Structures are given as structure tokens and as C-alpha cells.
């Protein structure tokens, strides 16, 4: 779809294309079915593969727009509660790994670097969202969901939380009676010191 680009009066839009059909979904029929093999048969490299659609990118639109902006959240979503509940338990660890899909929070792969992508789609620490990136600022209109949705790295607060949850979990198991009463709390150390 296209705006009237020859328009006389000045508008916030000057000219705007739409990729209406959002047929990127068809490539996703393919690759998503391929990932049906397994998780991690899902990849940020598939995220990178947005180039292989129309020679383009994955600034998604329509419900796929939503799924895209939700994309990491989609995956993270129960990890969120794997924290809420299961950081009191264990697979918080896995949730960490899943954040590590979204990002590299962990203390690792300094040398591997472009191992995780010769194109620097990722960054040493992918501080923005793996699909996403920073943008021009804007003037406010702001029901809370707007914030909950805002196109900004603030979301890293998540990682911060996750991390504190990790150490907090460790702290509680150390709240358990155990003569090795400092010991593995060293990880509480490592964590805290990571900030």
C-alpha cells in the first residue's frame, strides 16, 4: 500500500510503502516448519535471514508485526515465570539461556564474537533486542501499555532482574543449613560483582 506521495501539503508521512501482504509469513511457513524440528532450530540467524526476504528485512507489519515485536517476548514469556516461580526452582538457568538467545548477558564468547555472526547483527553485548535496534526520539502520548511496548533498550531491566533472581535463588539455598555455608555463595559474589 502507498500513500499519496505527490502530496502538496506537508505531512508527517512524506511517502509510505506498506508491504501489506506480509508474505514474509510464507518464508516463515518454510523456516518455521523447519524449526518445528526443534527449538534452536529457531535462530537469531533466522532473524538475520530477514535479508533473504525480498532482499530485505523484518520490520514486520500486521499480526506478524505484532509477533515480531513480541518475538523475543514470545520465547521469553514463560521463562518470565520460570523466573517468577522457577527461580525459586532451577530452570531459571534455562530462562537465562533464553535471554542469552535474545542477548549475550553472560560472561562469555569474547573471542568467538562473529562466531555468533560474521555480520554484527548481534553486538558483543546485544543491548537492544536481537531483532530490534535504536531509533529517533518522539513526543509523548503515553498510556502505560505504550511504555510496556516502547521501542527502547529499557527492557534490559529484564536481564537485570533475571540476574538478581539467579543470585537470590542461590542466596536462599544458602539460607538452607549447610556447613559449606559460604562456598557456592561465591556465585552470589560473581553475580553481584557483575554490577
Amino acid at each position: 500500500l502507498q500513500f499519496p506521495e505527490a502530496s502538496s501539503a506537508d505531512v508527517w508521512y512524506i511517502g509510505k510503502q506498506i508491504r501489506l501482504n506480509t508474505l514474509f509469513a510464507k518464508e516463515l511457513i518454510g523456516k518455521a516448519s523447519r524449526s518445528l524440528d526443534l527449538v534452536l532450530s529457531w535462530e537469531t540467524q533466522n532473524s538475520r535471514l530477514e535479508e533473504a526476504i525480498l532482499g530485505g528485512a523484518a520490520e514486520l507489519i500486521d499480526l506478524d508485526g505484532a509477533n515480531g515485536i513480541y518475538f523475543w517476548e514470545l520465547f521469553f514469556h514463560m521463562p518470565f515465570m520460570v523466573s517468577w516461580r522457577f527461580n525459586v526452582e532451577q530452570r531459571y538457568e534455562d530462562a537465562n539461556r533464553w535471554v542469552k538467545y535474545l542477548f549475550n548477558p553472560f560472561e562469555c564468547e569474547d573471542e568467538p564474537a562473529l562466531l555468533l555472526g560474521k555480520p554484527p547483527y548481534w553486538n558483543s553485548r546485544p543491548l537492544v533486542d536481537e531483532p530490534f535496534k535504536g531509533y529517533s526520539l518522539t513526543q509523548p502520548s503515553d498510556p502505560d501499555a505504550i511504555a510496556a511496548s516502547d521501542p527502547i533498550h529499557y527492557r534490559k531491566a529484564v536481564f537485570n532482574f533475571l540476574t538478581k533472581n539467579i543470585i537470590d535463588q542461590g542466596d536462599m539455598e544458602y539460607r538452607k543449613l549447610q556447613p559449606s555455608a559460604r562456598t557456592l555463595a561465591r556465585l552470589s559474589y560473581s553475580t553481584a560483582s557483575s554490577l
Binding site: 560472561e107 569474547d110 573471542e111 553485548r125 543491548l127 560483582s193 554490577l195
Partner: peptide, 29 residues
């Protein structure tokens, strides 16, 4: 150095305080 050196880049917002509108809620004006 140490392998995979730690780097919590607290990216520089140069964090500075922000006004509550509840204080001076009259801004509702």
C-alpha cells in the same frame, strides 16, 4: 586481563532525577 572480561556496560544515561507530577499535581491545569 581475564578471559571473557566482565563488562556490565551501564550505558551512560547520565542518570538524573525526574519530577513527579503528583507533586504539584495542579499541573493537571
Amino acid at each position: 586481563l581475564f578471559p571473557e572480561p566482565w563488562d556490565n556496560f551501564c550505558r551512560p544515561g547520565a542518570i538524573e532525577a525526574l519530577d513527579s507530577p503528583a507533586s504539584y499535581l495542579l499541573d493537571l491545569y
